[PDB]
């Protein structure tokens, strides 16, 4: 009987796109075929924001663009504080032990969180190298999330995904901020000599279903169902590691020097980043949950 429309932000041939089906079929069978998921594309319905007003469609997969669009009270963008969550394991612990705090803001918008996961680890892809974070901050790097980095002292240009190549070839950009799969799969690696391999922070997503539609689901099924969404989260975080190493080696075989930070440097960057954290808190409180912030540092 029950069929759910999830507007999906997952890419065409991506592992997310595949994982979302593996879940939909994993659920269907668990409900005995009664309940399932039909995916709709967010570009098609007018973008992440236009998707919001359609909650017609009961459920969504969101990046922090829309995830913090319906819960300004959301901590969220807190997780992408630089060097806060610096590796795949640390991210697991944080989505696991910390679920309820991440969740609650969204029941304040009237949604149940199905599961959390990662779109990728931000990296810098640059024409020149850098001795320190500061020097890197001098470079004009192109990329919501961007306005934050600007604060930390990152010179940033806000540009469409297209104009990147022209702007590089023009010397109007020294590089850009992105994930490995993007810079590989687009061929944009061709225009860049250096890629940071040291993870900065996760880009978190994002699956929500409407409180009402989550009602049509019989009490019985909720548990193993939601344990299926967490199975998924874990599979991805693994596969994503594999895919990122692949994308790195392909970037490297292609002649790009791969930048690696030493623990020395990593602590040096952590500190310079923690100082900016104070600064953001002033220049916007709503984009950081300070108790979520600290509870994460506690956790490791």
């Amino acid at each position: 009987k029950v069929v759910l429309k999830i507007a999906s932000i997952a890419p065409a041939r991506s592992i997310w796109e595949t994982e979302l089906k593996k879940l939909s079929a994993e659920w269907s069978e668990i409900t005995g075929g009664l309940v399932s998921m039909k995916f709709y594309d967010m570009s098609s319905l007018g973008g992440e924001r236009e998707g919001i007003r359609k909650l017609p469609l009961d459920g969504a997969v969101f990046s922090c663009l829309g995830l913090s669009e319906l819960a300004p009270d959301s901590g969220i963008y807190t997780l992408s504080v630089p060097f806060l969550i610096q590796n795949e394991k640390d991210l697991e612990r944080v989505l696991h032990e910390l679920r309820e705090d991440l969740d609650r803001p969204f029941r304040a918008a009237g949604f149940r969180v199905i599961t959390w996961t990662n779109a990728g680890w931000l990296s810098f892809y640059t024409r020149a190298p850098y001795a320190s974070l500061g020097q890197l901050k001098k470079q004009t790097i192109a990329l919501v999330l961007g306005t934050c980095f600007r604060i930390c002292g990152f010179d940033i240009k806000d540009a469409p995904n297209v104009r990147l190549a022209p702007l590089l070839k023009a010397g109007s950009i020294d590089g850009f901020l992105s994930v490995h799969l993007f810079t590989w799969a687009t061929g944009f690696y061709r225009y860049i000599s250096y890629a940071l391999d040291t993870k900065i922070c996760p880009a978190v997503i994002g699956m929500l279903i409407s409180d009402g539609s989550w009602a049509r689901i019989p009490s019985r099924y909720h548990d193993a169902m939601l344990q299926a969404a967490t199975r998924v989260r874990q599979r991805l975080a693994n596969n994503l590691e594999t895919l990122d190493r692949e994308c790195s080696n392909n970037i490297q075989k292609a002649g790009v020097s791969i930048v690696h930070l030493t623990p020395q440097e990593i602590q040096e960057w952590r500190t310079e980043f923690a100082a900016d954290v104070k600064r953001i808190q002033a220049r916007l409180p709503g984009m950081l949950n300070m108790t979520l912030y600290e509870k994460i540092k506690h956790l490791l």
Binding site: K22, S24, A185, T186
Partner: protein, 273 residues
Amino acid sequence: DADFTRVFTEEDDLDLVAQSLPLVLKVYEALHLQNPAHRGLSLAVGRLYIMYANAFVQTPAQYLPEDEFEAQNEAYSRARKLYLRGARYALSSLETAYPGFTREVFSGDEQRLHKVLSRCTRVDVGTLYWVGTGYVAAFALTPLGSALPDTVHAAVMMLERACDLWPSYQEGAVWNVLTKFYAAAPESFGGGMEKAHTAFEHLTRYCSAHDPDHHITYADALCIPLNNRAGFDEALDRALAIDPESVPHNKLLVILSQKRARWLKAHVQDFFL
């Protein structure tokens, strides 16, 4: 032979065609390996592999239930591989005419690429189309990150070359393929909706009134992503209006295409709202 291709193309029974073809490819392939230099053969076997992947590998899989998706993924992978194989076969006819072709076109050097394509004539158009088409079909079944952006670009440049030599070719078929490609790629991948519509306009100059494909292409490469159900619905009605008995040639492909339109209409709910 002409009357032999007829028992296939003018056929209305998809199972029959599907059970008989594999051996036919195996033969044409064995022949081709005898005569690597024979260009019409190279192209013929490549064209067959491609058309077969589409109709009998990819297409049937698309009709699988959304929980059979693992079976559906194998099939997509199977079809991706057949597309590549058929594309290398066709390309090897170009390599026969223009030794060093492959190495240029896949150089990654835009100039070398364009130079080598510049030396192509109206005689190569069918070959360009099939190779370009075979790679683009493959790319569409290829896991994100597994493609090589230069390979795709090369393939697309071959199609655009074809258009330049012989715009009206095969009742517009090169535009059809191009339209699907531009609409499914970002303005950053060499695609876009503007390009896509432009290619479609050309397609409608050259296309036959008995061909369902261009209606279908309009419905699902344009109307869906632009969320136009109306356009989507009317186009499919146009596609389904055509009588297969009344078409001059390619009854099979009409029948195949209408099977798809029927399906698309059944599922309109999943593409809109």
